[PDB]
DNA sequence: GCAACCGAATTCGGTTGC
DNA sequence: GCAACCGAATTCGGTTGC
């Protein structure tokens, strides 16, 4: 299974931004990588929300993160995988 | 599988942007979704290229896209999957 | 914690000039 | 067909101020 465990977060772009910041400088040790704030940029789309991806050294560690971390009410989340080599 | 075939493109953020525009374009019928231009914000961060993700209604169609499309020399690419319900 | 807010920096769609 | 360029707009790291 060449997955990478990740979590996608969606909500108003600014609050997403500061959430990242906070994650960085309080919970650095709890995950691997973290995206800038993106959205879907085609016509198109599936939804209007900004997005920030976070990645993890393992499901077990992705677990430890969701226990410990306080997710702002204003932003919703989902778990998934992306191919590990896209990192 | 509940994977989504995708392609990730990396290079200088502007040229990436205009590539999107053109794709939109031009080759609208040749893929599903397309990201704004993101990067990793750490580091942690594996490289400092901007990134744009593209998604596809199927591998077969992801194929048809890579045949037809002219990828600027200045930007490199990779194939993968999310997963899927993250769209 | 949280997000509104700060100015400085970056990216936006779109266009035009190679 | 590329990306430098445009002026307008959005995201940036941080830092209050509740």
From Swiss-Prot, chains A, B:
It comes from the Viruses. One of its GO terms (molecular function) is DNA binding. Residues 3-87 are annotated as: DNA-binding domain. It comes from Human papillomavirus type 6a. Keywords: Activator, DNA replication, DNA-binding, Early protein, Host nucleus, Phosphoprotein, Repressor, Transcription, Transcription regulation. GO terms for cellular component: host cell nucleus. Transmembrane segments: none annotated. Binds DNA as homodimer. Interacts with protein E1; this interaction greatly increases E1 DNA-binding activity. Interacts with protein L1; this interaction enhances E2-dependent replication and transcription activation. Interacts with protein L2; this interaction inhibits E2 transcriptional activity but not DNA replication function E2. Interacts with protein E7; this interaction inhibits E7 oncogenic activity. Interacts with host TAF1; this interaction modulates E2-dependent transcriptional regulation. Interacts with host BRD4; this interaction mediates E2 transcriptional activation function. The keyword Coiled coil does not apply. One of its GO terms (biological process) is viral DNA genome replication. This is Regulatory protein E2. Belongs to the papillomaviridae E2 protein family. It is found in: Host nucleus. Phosphorylated. Plays a role in the initiation of viral DNA replication. A dimer of E2 interacts with a dimer of E1 in order to improve specificity of E1 DNA binding activity. Once the complex recognizes and binds DNA at specific sites, the E2 dimer is removed from DNA. E2 also regulates viral transcription through binding to the E2RE response element (5'-ACCNNNNNNGGT-3') present in multiple copies in the regulatory regions of the viral genome. Activates or represses transcription depending on E2RE's position with regards to proximal promoter elements including the TATA-box.
């Amino acid at each position: 299974s060449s997955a990478t465990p990740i979590v996608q977060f969606q909500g108003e772009s600014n609050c997403l931004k500061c959430f990242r910041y906070r994650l960085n400088d309080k919970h650095r040790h709890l995950f691997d990588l973290i995206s800038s704030t993106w959205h879907w940029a085609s016509p198109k789309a599936p939804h209007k929300h900004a997005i920030v991806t976070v990645t993890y050294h393992s499901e077990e560690q992705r677990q430890q993160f969701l226990n410990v971390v306080k997710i702002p009410p204003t932003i919703r989340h989902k778990l998934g995988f992306m191919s590990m080599h896209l990192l």
